[PDB]
Motif scaffolding. Structure first.
Motif, PDB file in Angstrom:
ATOM      1  N   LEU A   1       0.982  -0.706  -0.062  1.00 41.51           N
ATOM      2  CA  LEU A   1       0.220  -0.038  -0.516  1.00 41.51           C
ATOM      3  C   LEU A   1       1.123   1.245  -0.083  1.00 41.51           C
ATOM      4  O   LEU A   1       0.707   1.992  -0.407  1.00 41.51           O
ATOM      5  N   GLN A   2       2.013   1.850   0.928  1.00 47.00           N
ATOM      6  CA  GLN A   2       2.506   2.364   0.805  1.00 47.00           C
ATOM      7  C   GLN A   2       3.381   2.119  -0.738  1.00 47.00           C
ATOM      8  O   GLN A   2       3.303   3.680  -1.032  1.00 47.00           O
TER       9      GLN A   2
ATOM     10  N   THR B   1       2.358   1.864  -3.509  1.00 42.40           N
ATOM     11  CA  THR B   1       1.212   2.005  -4.335  1.00 42.40           C
ATOM     12  C   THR B   1       0.804   3.126  -4.486  1.00 42.40           C
ATOM     13  O   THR B   1       0.595   4.025  -4.718  1.00 42.40           O
ATOM     14  N   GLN B   2       1.342   3.956  -2.819  1.00 42.78           N
ATOM     15  CA  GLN B   2       0.792   5.336  -2.735  1.00 42.78           C
ATOM     16  C   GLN B   2       1.487   6.446  -3.058  1.00 42.78           C
ATOM     17  O   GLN B   2       1.260   7.147  -4.233  1.00 42.78           O
TER      18      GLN B   2
ATOM     19  N   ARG C   1       0.964   6.634  -6.907  1.00 37.72           N
ATOM     20  CA  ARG C   1       0.036   7.429  -7.457  1.00 37.72           C
ATOM     21  C   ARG C   1       0.635   9.302  -7.047  1.00 37.72           C
ATOM     22  O   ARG C   1       0.360   9.939  -8.297  1.00 37.72           O
ATOM     23  N   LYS C   2       1.504   9.324  -6.340  1.00 38.47           N
ATOM     24  CA  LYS C   2       1.674  10.378  -6.062  1.00 38.47           C
ATOM     25  C   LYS C   2       2.901  11.148  -7.135  1.00 38.47           C
ATOM     26  O   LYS C   2       2.729  12.210  -7.468  1.00 38.47           O
TER      27      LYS C   2
ATOM     28  N   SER D   1       0.942  12.047  -9.910  1.00 40.05           N
ATOM     29  CA  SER D   1      -0.387  12.963  -9.796  1.00 40.05           C
ATOM     30  C   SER D   1       0.941  14.711  -9.663  1.00 40.05           C
ATOM     31  O   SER D   1       0.209  15.369  -9.028  1.00 40.05           O
TER      32      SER D   1
ATOM     33  N   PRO E   1      -8.196   1.520   1.138  1.00 38.03           N
ATOM     34  CA  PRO E   1      -6.573   1.868   0.808  1.00 38.03           C
ATOM     35  C   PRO E   1      -5.914   2.189  -0.507  1.00 38.03           C
ATOM     36  O   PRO E   1      -5.613   2.684  -1.417  1.00 38.03           O
ATOM     37  N   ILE E   2      -5.382   0.639   0.113  1.00 37.35           N
ATOM     38  CA  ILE E   2      -4.893   0.391  -1.439  1.00 37.35           C
ATOM     39  C   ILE E   2      -5.717  -0.103  -2.600  1.00 37.35           C
ATOM     40  O   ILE E   2      -5.225   0.436  -3.953  1.00 37.35           O
TER      41      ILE E   2
ATOM     42  N   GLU F   1      -5.493   3.410  -3.713  1.00 32.00           N
ATOM     43  CA  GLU F   1      -4.602   3.955  -4.294  1.00 32.00           C
ATOM     44  C   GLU F   1      -4.037   3.711  -5.765  1.00 32.00           C
ATOM     45  O   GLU F   1      -4.044   4.076  -7.168  1.00 32.00           O
ATOM     46  N   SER F   2      -4.663   2.101  -5.711  1.00 32.25           N
ATOM     47  CA  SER F   2      -4.441   2.338  -6.866  1.00 32.25           C
ATOM     48  C   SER F   2      -5.493   1.876  -8.552  1.00 32.25           C
ATOM     49  O   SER F   2      -4.763   2.231  -9.376  1.00 32.25           O
TER      50      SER F   2
ATOM     51  N   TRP G   1      -6.367   5.185  -8.402  1.00 35.85           N
ATOM     52  CA  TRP G   1      -5.927   6.646  -9.035  1.00 35.85           C
ATOM     53  C   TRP G   1      -4.676   6.014  -9.469  1.00 35.85           C
ATOM     54  O   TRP G   1      -4.878   7.176 -11.237  1.00 35.85           O
TER      55      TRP G   1
END
Lengths: 15, 426
Positions: B23-24, B26-27, B30-31, B34, B64-65, B68-69, B71
């Motif tokens: 998850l970290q 993937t986040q 995403r960032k 972005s 959450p994941i 993030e995925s 996005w």
């Protein structure tokens, strides 16, 4: 007397 | 905490068997995707991360994941056709359609956004999204008594994705899909959010751009009055698509054009034909030309609304494309008009500017100008005033231009001006 004949297509979510 | 990561670090975190590390990572992806400046979409794709994000989209136990995925895949699919194809090849369409039913609004919204990007890529991916059964859940997300109870951005994204599902031709959207979607577009077109209204008008303009069957589909729903209302709107983002839709509708049969006229669209053209936006003026003159190519009662309606002076003005001073649309309108007028109507048009002062454009450097508009001149001269012969129009065209300095064009490269204009000069000035 004869007849004849843009928004975003894709969008990224940005911060 | 997850800013300025390296693609290597993202891959290392995704390849771990730790859901939280995944998850970290993937986040962080995403960032990284972005950022306005050069998102490393190609690097992320080459790393083979799309399948992992698609798999994460289905981890209902870890929303959450999922978000993030969603996005990350949305941003990837927002790029070139190759990148959208990369997202689709990972099986993301069914995953996003499944997440459309998520209990979290911010995840269903991201699914809507991703599906909208995919559909907007083109008609192929659009029809594929429709084949996976996205229309049903997308419209179910809008099955509410009052649309104002939904989040503004949520409704805007839904409307945009629906418009993308309506857009593109060769081929046009499936007829049954359009029938399924149209009621919701009517509802949205009666909404009050300006951006939602603009997107709905764009969708309608998409649907009305095609064979008369589609125009009839749209007009049978009775949205033409609302389209005219929005044509009178104050926001250019709303007026533009409404005018495009009206123009598309009037390109159909005379009966659909009459439906448009009955709604009162012509009463709005005094300002559209003088609108500050050149694109608006061009589109409105194109619509007027398509209207003047109809029956004689419709030409008389155009006359009664006092739009002939506005056409004269547009032909006298406007962008060259608007002037070409105006020349087409005048030619259609003279081809289908009543002798009295051609007389009225000439009395409004069209002859001088119509010869003024004879100095144009575009063969097509010169052909149109001379074709209209032929129509007007035929009307004058009928009425017995051919000498009057001869003297007119000779006094404003236009017959000089016709004599000049007598030796024109194109053969059509050559023959037309030659016939004119020989049959009216000998």
């Amino acid at each position: 007397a004869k007849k004849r004949v843009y928004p975003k297509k894709k969008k990224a979510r940005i911060e | 905490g997850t800013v300025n990561w390296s693609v290597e670090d993202i891959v290392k975190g995704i390849n771990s068997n730790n859901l939280e590390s995944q998850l970290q990572a993937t986040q962080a992806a995403r960032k990284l995707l972005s950022r306005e400046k050069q998102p490393p979409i190609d690097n992320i794709i080459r790393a083979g991360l799309i399948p992992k994000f698609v798999s994460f989209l289905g981890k209902t136990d870890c929303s959450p994941i999922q978000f993030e995925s969603a996005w990350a895949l949305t941003n990837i699919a927002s790029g070139t056709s190759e990148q959208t194809k990369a997202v689709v090849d990972g099986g993301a369409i069914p995953a996003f359609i499944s997440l459309l039913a998520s209990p979290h609004a911010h995840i269903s919204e991201q699914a809507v956004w991703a599906l909208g990007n995919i559909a907007g890529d083109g008609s192929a991916f659009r029809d594929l999204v429709i084949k996976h059964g996205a229309i049903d859940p997308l419209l179910a997300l809008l099955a509410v008594p009052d649309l104002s109870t939904l989040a503004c951005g949520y409704l805007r994204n839904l409307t945009w994705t629906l418009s993308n599902l309506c857009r593109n031709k060769n081929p046009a959207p499936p007829l049954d899909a359009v029938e399924q979607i149209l009621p919701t577009l009517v509802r949205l077109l009666h909404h009050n959010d300006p951006e939602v209204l603009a997107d709905s008008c764009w969708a309608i303009s998409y649907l009305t751009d095609g064979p008369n069957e589609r125009i009839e589909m749209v007009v049978k729903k009775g949205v033409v009055p609302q389209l005219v209302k929005l044509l009178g709107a104050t926001e250019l983002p709303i007026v533009t698509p409404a005018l495009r839709a009206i123009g598309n509708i009037v390109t159909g049969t005379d009966e659909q054009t009459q439906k448009v006229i009955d709604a009162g669209a012509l009463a709005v053209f005094p300002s559209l034909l003088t609108n500050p936006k050149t694109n608006i003026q061009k589109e409105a003159t194109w619509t007027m030309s398509n209207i003047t190519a109809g029956r004689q009662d419709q030409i008389q309606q155009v006359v009664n609304h006092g739009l002939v002076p506005f056409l004269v003005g547009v032909l006298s001073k406007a962008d060259f494309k608007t002037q070409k649309e105006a020349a087409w309108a005048i030619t259609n007028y003279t081809s289908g008009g009543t002798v009295e109507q051609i007389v009225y048009l000439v009395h409004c002062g069209i002859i001088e500017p119509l010869m003024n454009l004879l100095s144009a450097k575009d063969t097509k508009i010169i052909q149109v100008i001379l074709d209209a001149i032929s129509n007007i001269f035929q009307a004058a012969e009928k009425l017995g005033e051919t000498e009057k129009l001869s003297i007119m065209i000779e006094e404003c300095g236009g017959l000089d231009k016709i004599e000049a064009l007598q030796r024109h490269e194109n053969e059509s204009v050559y023959k037309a001006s030659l016939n004119l000069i020989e049959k009216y000035f000998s």
